[PDB]
Amino acid sequence: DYNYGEALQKAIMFYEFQMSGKLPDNIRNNWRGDSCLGDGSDVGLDLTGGWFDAGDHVKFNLPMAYTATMLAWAVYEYKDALQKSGQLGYLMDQIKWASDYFIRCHPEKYVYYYQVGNGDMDHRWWVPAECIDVQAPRPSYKVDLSNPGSTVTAGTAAALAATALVFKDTDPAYAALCIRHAKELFDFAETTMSDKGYTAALNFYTSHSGWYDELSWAGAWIYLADGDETYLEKAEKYVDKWPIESQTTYIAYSWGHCWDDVHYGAALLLAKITNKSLYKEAIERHLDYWTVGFNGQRVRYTPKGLAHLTDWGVLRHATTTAFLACVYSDWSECPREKANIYIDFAKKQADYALGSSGRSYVVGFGVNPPQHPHHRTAHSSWCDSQKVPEYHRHVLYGALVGGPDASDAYVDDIGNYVTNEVACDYNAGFVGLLAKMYEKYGGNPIPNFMAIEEKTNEEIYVEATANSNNGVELKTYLYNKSGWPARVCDKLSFRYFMDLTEYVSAGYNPNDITVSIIYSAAPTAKISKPILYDASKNIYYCEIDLSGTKIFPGSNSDHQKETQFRIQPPAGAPWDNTNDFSYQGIKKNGEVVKEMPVYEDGVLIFGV
Ligand SMILES: [Ca+2]
Ligand SMILES: [Ca+2]
């Protein structure tokens, strides 16, 4: 059988790679650093934190809130299994990472920021998370009473209520904070009944289904968190506003639970809360359609057994429905025959994602996993190209990709933003599915698993050429191809070492040597007079300081800065470049000159 504990371990770790903001020191990788620390600065608020949505760096709160709710749902249903796997703490930390962010986005009762970053502006740049905020502004978008967003506020209410539910025993004060914000956001959504102000997510996370399903979703979670029947009643109030399967009176059943349709999960929760036939029949009708069929109709299946609802995020849909199948099949009121059908269906969808069709569709897991997920920071280009490097510098452990077509066909290409898309909501229900599969079938996680990668290219270094000319003239490029993690540097300098024995032995003062910047792409570039390095051997160096100029792996030729400079003695003084340490290195290998060491804020970071 497949190792569900390892899969669960990695599916949860995936969210660490999506973290935005000032990162905790207990992350388990060496290739994510601080990012987007100025989020919210355009409106005078701290709106850092949360997750980047997909392979981009926009923070879309509707799918982010959906994700957090689903992860908390996994905790709620499968806490003990998650504890045993060793991953419950990390999952809870990720849930709180998102929820802390939602709370900051809600500075007053009827004002909610639902997006940080602009989709069109953000997606123009194929650069790592640690550099994206240098390339374009990241505006903060909000809804309020004059420009409302019932769908996203209700969605966030559900996330904070679900967070309160799972934290109320271990952190009563935080749960009380979450539940208050939840009820306020619910009232906000219910008061406005409109998405008129929810515009910044157009073409990315538009709500075609509206907010009535979200109101039942949020109401049910609020009730579960603190037992307020006022919100269960409101949740049931809006059931008759849910989508209806056309040509029938049935609650819609032929799609699936996802970020833009939560009435499937809402029906399941309301079923367990009230045991009412309406909800039990609705969810059974849905799960039947996905398994054995309903009234002569059944979801499409690939020849190799994948339930194939659509071509967009097909594995996201199959694994999420499987999760719901797990929850309902574990319920005592679920008819036994179909409890077995449902859980058998859930395992097969889990096993398809993990490799039953011949390859894994989970990055970094199993047999022949995808290697080119459509993900900027895991690829980690230093020059704003999907094609450079031609392989990902990092392994996005645990990422469930979009998946194959209805014939099980699939191509692993970074440019296929459909088959190789990855996203927060793709892994959300997946985590809960793997929790149940671990609870039932086991599979040992990797002990103390850490995503500490080997650095496969030199991050920061000088490339240089030189020519002798009554002294020396240097043409240098100071590179920042950092990757572990990518980072912006603005305090970089390097040293050029010389042996001035022939010069000082002839009676000349090193301070009369001319040092000059000829040209530099760094406007702050400066060069020091010779500095004594070894009084016994008359070794000196000149410091070329580019502090003040950003050098980072991004676009606009920012991953390198050219500096041309000259070091020339007074006319007539002896000069021998051939005994100069840095000159010798340049002529040995100008590509990477260890003999011109690089310093960041005065600390050596490369070279001898
Ligand atoms: Ca909706
Ligand atoms: Ca010399």
Automatic annotation (TrEMBL):
Its EC number is 3.2.1.-. The active site is at H374, D412, E421. Residues 453-608 form the CBM3 domain. It catalyses: Endohydrolysis of (1->4)-beta-D-glucosidic linkages in cellulose, lichenin and cereal beta-D-glucans. GO terms for biological process: cellulose catabolic process. Ca(2+) 2 binds at S209, G210, D213, D260. Transmembrane segments: none annotated. Keywords: Calcium, Carbohydrate metabolism, Cellulose degradation, Glycosidase, Hydrolase, Metal-binding, Polysaccharide degradation, Signal. Ca(2+) 1 binds at S209, G210, D213, E214. GO terms for molecular function: cellulase activity; cellulose binding; metal ion binding. Ca(2+) 3 binds at D499, E502, D576, N579, D580. It comes from the Bacteria. The keyword Nucleotide-binding does not apply. Belongs to the glycosyl hydrolase 9 (cellulase E) family. This is Glucanase. It comes from Acetivibrio thermocellus (strain ATCC 27405 / DSM 1237 / JCM 9322 / NBRC 103400 / NCIMB 10682 / NRRL B-4536 / VPI 7372) (Clostridium thermocellum).
